[PDB]
Amino acid sequence: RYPMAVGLNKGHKVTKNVSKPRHSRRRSRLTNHTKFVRDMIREVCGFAPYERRAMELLKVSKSKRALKFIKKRVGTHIRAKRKREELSNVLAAMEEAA
Amino acid sequence: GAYKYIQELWRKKQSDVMRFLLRVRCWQYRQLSALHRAPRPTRPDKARRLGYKAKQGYVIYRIRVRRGGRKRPVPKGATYGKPVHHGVNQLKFARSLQSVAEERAGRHCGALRVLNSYWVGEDSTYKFFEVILIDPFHKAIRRNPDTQWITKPVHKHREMRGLTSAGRKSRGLGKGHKFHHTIGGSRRAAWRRRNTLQLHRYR
Amino acid sequence: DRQTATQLLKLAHKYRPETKQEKKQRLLARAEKKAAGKGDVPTKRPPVLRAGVNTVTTLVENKKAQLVVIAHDVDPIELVVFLPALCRKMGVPYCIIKGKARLGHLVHRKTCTTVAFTQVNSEDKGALAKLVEAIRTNYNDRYDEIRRHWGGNVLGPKSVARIAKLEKAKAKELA
Amino acid sequence: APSRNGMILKPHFHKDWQQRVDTWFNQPARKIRRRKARQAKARRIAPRPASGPIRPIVRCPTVRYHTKVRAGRGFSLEELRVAGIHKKVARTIGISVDPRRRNKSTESLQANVQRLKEYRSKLILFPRKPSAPKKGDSSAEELKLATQLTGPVMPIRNVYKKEKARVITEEEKNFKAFASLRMARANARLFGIRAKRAKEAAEQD
RNA sequence: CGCGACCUCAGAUCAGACGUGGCGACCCGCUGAAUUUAAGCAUAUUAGUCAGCGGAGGAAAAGAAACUAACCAGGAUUCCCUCAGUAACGGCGAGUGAACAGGGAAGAGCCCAGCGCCGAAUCCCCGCCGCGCGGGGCGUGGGAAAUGUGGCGUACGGAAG
RNA sequence: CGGCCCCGGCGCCGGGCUCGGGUCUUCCCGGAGUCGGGUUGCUUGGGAAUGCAGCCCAAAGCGGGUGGUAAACUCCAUCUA
Ligand SMILES: [Mg+2]
Ligand SMILES: [Mg+2]
Numbered sequence: 001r002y003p004m005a006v007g008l009n010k011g012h013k014v015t016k017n018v019s020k021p022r023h024s025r026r027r028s029r030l031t032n033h034t035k036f037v038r039d040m041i042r043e044v045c046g047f048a049p050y051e052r053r054a055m056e057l058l059k060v061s062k063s064k065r066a067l068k069f070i071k072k073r074v075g076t077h078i079r080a081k082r083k084r085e086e087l088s089n090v091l092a093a094m095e096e097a098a
Numbered sequence: 099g100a101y102k103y104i105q106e107l108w109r110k111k112q113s114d115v116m117r118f119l120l121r122v123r124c125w126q127y128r129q130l131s132a133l134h135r136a137p138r139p140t141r142p143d144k145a146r147r148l149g150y151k152a153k154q155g156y157v158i159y160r161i162r163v164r165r166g167g168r169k170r171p172v173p174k175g176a177t178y179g180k181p182v183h184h185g186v187n188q189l190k191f192a193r194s195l196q197s198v199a200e201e202r203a204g205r206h207c208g209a210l211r212v213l214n215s216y217w218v219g220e221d222s223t224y225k226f227f228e229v230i231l232i233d234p235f236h237k238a239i240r241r242n243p244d245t246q247w248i249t250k251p252v253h254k255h256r257e258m259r260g261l262t263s264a265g266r267k268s269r270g271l272g273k274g275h276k277f278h279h280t281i282g283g284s285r286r287a288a289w290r291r292r293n294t295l296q297l298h299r300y301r
Numbered sequence: 302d303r304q305t306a307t308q309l310l311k312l313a314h315k316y317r318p319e320t321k322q323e324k325k326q327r328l329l330a331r332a333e334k335k336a337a338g339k340g341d342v343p344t345k346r347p348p349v350l351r352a353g354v355n356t357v358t359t360l361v362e363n364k365k366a367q368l369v370v371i372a373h374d375v376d377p378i379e380l381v382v383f384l385p386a387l388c389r390k391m392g393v394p395y396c397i398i399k400g401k402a403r404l405g406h407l408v409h410r411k412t413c414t415t416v417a418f419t420q421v422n423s424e425d426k427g428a429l430a431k432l433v434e435a436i437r438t439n440y441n442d443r444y445d446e447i448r449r450h451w452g453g454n455v456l457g458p459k460s461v462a463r464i465a466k467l468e469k470a471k472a473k474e475l476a
Numbered sequence: 477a478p479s480r481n482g483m484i485l486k487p488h489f490h491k492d493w494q495q496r497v498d499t500w501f502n503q504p505a506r507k508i509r510r511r512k513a514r515q516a517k518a519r520r521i522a523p524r525p526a527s528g529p530i531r532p533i534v535r536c537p538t539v540r541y542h543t544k545v546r547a548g549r550g551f552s553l554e555e556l557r558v559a560g561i562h563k564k565v566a567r568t569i570g571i572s573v574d575p576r577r578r579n580k581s582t583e584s585l586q587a588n589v590q591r592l593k594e595y596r597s598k599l600i601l602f603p604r605k606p607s608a609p610k611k612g613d614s615s616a617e618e619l620k621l622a623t624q625l626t627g628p629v630m631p632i633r634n635v636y637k638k639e640k641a642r643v644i645t646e647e648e649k650n651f652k653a654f655a656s657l658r659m660a661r662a663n664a665r666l667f668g669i670r671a672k673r674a675k676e677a678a679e680q681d
Numbered sequence: 682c683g684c685g686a687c688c689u690c691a692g693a694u695c696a697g698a699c700g701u702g703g704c705g706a707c708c709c710g711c712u713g714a715a716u717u718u719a720a721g722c723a724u725a726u727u728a729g730u731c732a733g734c735g736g737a738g739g740a741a742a743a744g745a746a747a748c749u750a751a752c753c754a755g756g757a758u759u760c761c762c763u764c765a766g767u768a769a770c771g772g773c774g775a776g777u778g779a780a781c782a783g784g785g786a787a788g789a790g791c792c793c794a795g796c797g798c799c800g801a802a803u804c805c806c807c808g809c810c811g812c813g814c815g816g817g818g819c820g821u822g823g824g825a826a827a828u829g830u831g832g833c834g835u836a837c838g839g840a841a842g
Numbered sequence: 843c844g845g846c847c848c849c850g851g852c853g854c855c856g857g858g859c860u861c862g863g864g865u866c867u868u869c870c871c872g873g874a875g876u877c878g879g880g881u882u883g884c885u886u887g888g889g890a891a892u893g894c895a896g897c898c899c900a901a902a903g904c905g906g907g908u909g910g911u912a913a914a915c916u917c918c919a920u921c922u923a
């Protein structure tokens with residue numbers, strides 16, 4: 001009924017701005033060229049020692065141990081999840097193929 | 099072009115192809131002097147993204163520093179003070195090794211201006227850096243309007259005052275709630291501003 | 302080898318970058334013949350090789366280079382390690398040669414890293430295609446073997462002679 | 477040290493303060509310097525008004541001051557685009573531009589573009605030669621005035637909707653109450669808990 | 682064996698040019714105690730001060746958010762009044778202690794590395810030629826720097842074709 | 843107030859550079875031993891550690907930082923070091 005200072009829907013009622021967000025918010029997006037150069041340098045450099053150890057761990061059914069190892073190597077847990085995902089992807093992309 | 103490739107290749111400096119190069123270059127730099135002139139930058143992309151241009155008047159120096167924390171110069175480890183100041187062994191310098199490298203380079207060459215620096219190699223006993231110096235009195239730099247700011251006498255010895263990119267980090271400057279130490283200028287300026295008694299005429 | 306490299310050099314000697322003297326000459330003659338003949342394009346674009354690692358990379362990425370030649374006397378190897386894999390991915394023929402100064406002399410500079418052949422005359426197209434095949438069968442078709450090959454790991458002769466003495470004395474004891 | 481009865485005091489005079497004491501004995505001289513600088517700047521820029529760059533309509537962020545409105549730094553790029561003038565020309569026209577500010581409410585967007593249109597309509601600029609368009613034959617005898625004070629075209633004086641008086645409706649006697657605010661606060665506090673309870677109930681089904 | 686090119690390098694009283702040191706009231710970087718208070722004293726306070734070292738300018742630093750807030754949002758930095766002796770820190774003892782608002786003084790914004798296009802259209806030096814008072818820059822020709830990357834066009838507020 | 847001498851700008855007579863705005867179609871869009879984490883010192887009012895530094899571990903591109911109490915799941919706001 002009446003707009004209240006507290007509640008699920010508080011504050012003075014206004015209309016939203018449908019304007020396009022600024023281009024600085026769009027940063028480090030997946031680009032074709034960037035993905036190409038990254039994938040080209042990845043196969044040239046190979047992998048890191050801890051990356052190879054984690055791939056060996058993923059090859060065995062022990063996955064929580066590899067997650068803990070990655071969380072101990074890199075800083076936070078949210079980075080460890082993404083690293084584990086990338087390692088599983090690179091292990092399942094070409095090693096599963098003939 | 100290719101600088102993006104070199105950057106994305108140097109980013110993964112733990113692979114074998116890069117580790118071999120870093121080890122060989124560290125071994126090669128260990129035999130040279132503590133301070134010398136590199137005729138061309140080992141990291142061209144890193145020098146370009148710092149402000150190095152392939153033209154006359156820009157010099158590159160390679161300098162090594164001793165890795166490790168500092169020790170108190172007190173004799174026999176005696177401070178003659180309260181126990182809180184008995185920390186002779188485990189003390190850490192406020193400035194970084196890169197910053198003290200830039201400082202040593204600018205002290206050895208006063209006629210040149212330290213622009214920036216970057217890391218090339220390191221080991222257990224040494225850490226190597228490459229610094230960029232500008233000749234403020236060369237005609238190829240004084241005539242270019244984009245680099246005329248390095249000629250003014252206000253930028254004399256930027257490395258000894260923390261104006262470089264390495265010293266700016268150790269100064270503690272920044273904008274946000276995490277940098278309330280030095281609001282305006284330096285932490286000493288903030289201290290002088292917040293610890294002065296304002297006595298107006300009418301009070 | 303000393304034969305195919307010299308052949309590639311003799312081929313490149315025809316498409317050398319145009320020097321500054323004759324560049325000023327042609328720029329002075331262009332403004333004169335333009336007012337003389339009143340023509341739009343009286344001089345066809347001359348096919349010339351492209352120098353510089355950035356230019357070579359931007360050409361091979363867009364698949365505009367017919368051939369790539371690389372030097373190996375570069376001090377920082379990282380500026381060059383990425384190029385052979387890129388040419389293998391793009392399918393263009395790449396070849397490594399000895400002497401950046403020798404590569405350099407054609408471009409009238411002290412040091413030149415890489416050179417890309419993009420446009421070739423109709424009468425040199427056959428001579429170029431005759432050598433791109435031998436280059437592909439030497440570098441492109443053997444890329445997997447080159448990537449799997451590990452060099453170095455060679456001990457000194459003073460350390461090989463002693464192990465030879467030991468293996469001889471051991472073989473004389475076994476049989 | 478203490479006395480019979482008194483407020484406990486903690487004076488911050490334990491430091492060495494007498495060697496850093498700022499006395500304002502140069503305050504009249506500073507005010508005179510500032511006044512002379514203002515006069516010199518206005519005399520040098522006489523055709524342009526003091527505090528030349530027009531400033532937009534700006535609402536205070538915090539809830540303590542969000543009821544009043546104040547001046548700001550510059551107009552947003554969206555407001556410039558709705559006004560129809562280029563971004564870089566507004567600076568030499570005399571319009572301060574703030575590229576960092578965003579626009580979240582059309583209610584403020586329309587007010588800002590209206591202020592910009594009013595400034596543009598009231599603006600009269602001088603050319604080098606009469607060959608420049610968007611002007612008149614005579615510049616109103618120096619525009620009837622050379623310099624303006626305390627805002628270029630208009631200050632940010634507050635206006636308020638009147639809502640003078642009206643007849644009370646029927647259900648207004650039992651429309652709102654303190655219980656309404658109490659229920660609103662209770663729902664805002666127990667919103668997620670009820671959702672989790674409904675989820676765990678539908679789980680059993 | 683020699684020659685030549687490149688690359689890491691050495692010497693000169695080579696041609697031209699630059700730094701040293703002094704003052705240091707104000708400013709910047711480092712480390713730097715104790716007397717005192719805590720009615721004693723170790724944590725703490727004195728103090729991130731004094732002393733010590735390194736630098737410049739009439740100002741220096743700062744300065745265009747990897748910001749503040751959680752509502753009707755604001756918008757570089759610097760200084761003043763308030764916030765405030767407050768939030769908070771502390772043998773939670775002595776004591777220490779900000780910040781965001783808001784109102785004022787002033788308010789100027791931009792560049793580059795990268796990504797791409799331009800036959801390197803770029804820059805330094807040398808010498809004769811056409812110019813002005815007290816002397817330095819405009820047009821011409823060769824010696825170097827530079828393709829391991831000059832310069833215009835570009836900068837997150839998008840840009841290019 | 844006058845007269846005299848010296849210095850600096852505002853208007854006018856040679857010389858060298860010199861396409862902006864909007865819609866549409868196509869492409870491009872980023873700073874690394876760095877962030878962050880562990881640990882040890884100094885410092886801060888900053889408290890499951892505000893900032894700096896030494897050693898070790900050391901990345902991503904629907905990513906990263908911040909949202910003042912550490913940790914997991916989800917969403918939101920702001921910025922692009
Ligand atoms: Mg993002
Ligand atoms: Mg040189």
Ligand SMILES: [Mg+2]
Nearest residue numbers: 176177178179
């Ligand atoms: Mg003593």
Ligand SMILES: [Mg+2]
Nearest residue numbers: 261742743744
């Ligand atoms: Mg600065």
Ligand SMILES: [Mg+2]
Nearest residue numbers: 298299300301
């Ligand atoms: Mg009083």
Ligand SMILES: [Mg+2]
Nearest residue numbers: 477478479480
């Ligand atoms: Mg008494």
Ligand SMILES: [Mg+2]
Nearest residue numbers: 718719720721
């Ligand atoms: Mg006593």
Ligand SMILES: [Mg+2]
Nearest residue numbers: 716717721722
């Ligand atoms: Mg005592």
Ligand SMILES: [Mg+2]
Nearest residue numbers: 490491492727
């Ligand atoms: Mg005292």
Ligand SMILES: [Mg+2]
Nearest residue numbers: 726728729885
């Ligand atoms: Mg202290």
Ligand SMILES: [Mg+2]
Nearest residue numbers: 730731732733
């Ligand atoms: Mg002192």
Ligand SMILES: [Mg+2]
Nearest residue numbers: 255702736737
């Ligand atoms: Mg000095």
Ligand SMILES: [Mg+2]
Nearest residue numbers: 251737738739
């Ligand atoms: Mg002076």
Ligand SMILES: [Mg+2]
Nearest residue numbers: 745746837922
């Ligand atoms: Mg910015």
Ligand SMILES: [Mg+2]
Nearest residue numbers: 764765766767
């Ligand atoms: Mg009070």
Ligand SMILES: [Mg+2]
Nearest residue numbers: 770771885886
């Ligand atoms: Mg403490």
Ligand SMILES: [Mg+2]
Nearest residue numbers: 485486775776
């Ligand atoms: Mg107290």
Ligand SMILES: [Mg+2]
Nearest residue numbers: 726728729777
């Ligand atoms: Mg204190």
